[PDB]
Design a protein around this ligand. Structure first.
Ligand SMILES: Nc1ncnc2c1ncn2[C@@H]1O[C@H](COP(=O)(O)OP(=O)(O)OP(=O)(O)O)[C@@H](O)[C@H]1O
Ligand SMILES: [Mg+2]
Lengths: 201, 86
DNA sequence: AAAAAAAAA
């Protein structure tokens, strides 16, 4: 209730938290069931705050930052147990969020290499680890929500949408909903938002 | 301290974000550098529209005199359309 | 096995 406007964003979040059912067929294999939402906008438009709210209000969620993560360590790791003396896989960040939601910030600032590690998950919702003699497929049926800044400091409404977004189209086609937000300067809205923010403090 | 006034006045600077609403305000009456009629307040200053003003008779409305101004703000420009002055 | 700093391509 402390965020002004963005009503359609709130409706989209509500529909995403309780998305559709998954489908399995004896011949059609598997069909994806949930919704992923990506938002892009110029700075200081209350995206990270909404992300924190979604973290707080969800049944299960994991917070992730683009810069402070490694794709190989995001899915699984190899660690040797001190007691048994053998090496066993340790669950990564996204595997822990099975049947949950993952929020990633600074997505456009996240390394290109690790991006493919995300795309695999967006392909079949399953990660395959084949390293050091372990061959296993781990289920990860989570939904991902991310917010990214345009290539420039501010959004250019006169340019190609592909030009403003640094991410390749291959992964952008996966997201069901794409939202672009801008802080258009208007004195009426400025006064309303100023009154609201002062009321909150 | 007047008995009647306990409606409340509004500072000039608080007129920026609202329009199509009546207001009451007072301040110094004078001419701007451009040559129009303006009201001054410690908060700020606005312009005056006189074309439909009915003044309270019995006074010498002279520049430099405090006047109570009632009218409707318009954010299309900066014109405060005064409906009465006393 | 996995993260982090350095010089050369
Ligand atoms: N509609 C709004 N309602 C309430 N607060 C808002 C609104 N828009 C912006 N803010 C405020 O703007 C500030 C910026 O917050 P935040 O950094 O999370 O925003 P952002 O749009 O995600 O920015 P960035 O691109 O830097 O991550 C916050 O303190 C937030 O309260
Ligand atoms: Mg932010």
């Amino acid at each position: 209730p402390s965020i002004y406007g963005h009503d359609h964003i709130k409706k989209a979040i509500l529909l995403m938290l309780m998305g559709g059912v998954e489908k399995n067929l004896e011949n059609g294999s598997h069909l994806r069931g949930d919704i992923n939402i990506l938002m892009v906008g110029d700075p200081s438009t209350a995206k990270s705050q909404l992300l924190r709210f979604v973290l707080n209000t969800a049944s299960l969620a994991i917070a992730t930052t683009g810069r402070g993560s490694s794709g190989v360590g995001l899915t699984a790791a190899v660690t040797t147990d001190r007691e048994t003396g053998e090496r066993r896989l340790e669950a990564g960040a996204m595997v822990l969020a099975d049947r949950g939601v993952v929020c990633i910030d600074e997505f456009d600032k996240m390394t290109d290499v690790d991006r493919v590690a995300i795309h695999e998950v967006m392909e079949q919702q399953t990660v395959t680890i084949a390293k050091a003699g372990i061959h296993t497929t781990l289920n990860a049926r989570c939904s991902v929500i991310a917010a990214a800044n345009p290539v420039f400091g501010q959004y250019d409404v006169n340019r190609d949408p592909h030009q403003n977004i640094a991410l390749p189209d291959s992964l952008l086609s996966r997201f069901d909903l794409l939202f672009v937000v801008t802080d258009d300067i208007n004195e009426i809205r400025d006064r309303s938002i100023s009154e609201h923010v002062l009321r909150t403090h | 301290r007047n008995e009647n006034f306990q409606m409340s006045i509004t500072p000039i600077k608080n007129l920026l974000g609202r329009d199509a609403q009546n207001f009451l305000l007072l301040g110094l009456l004078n001419k701007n550098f451009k040559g129009n009629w303006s009201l001054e307040d410690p908060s700020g200053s606005v312009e005056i529209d006189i074309s439909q003003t009915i003044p309270t008779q019995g006074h010498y409305y002279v520049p430099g005199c405090m006047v109570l101004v009632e009218g409707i703000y318009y954010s299309v420009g900066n014109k405060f359309h005064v409906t009465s002055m006393t």
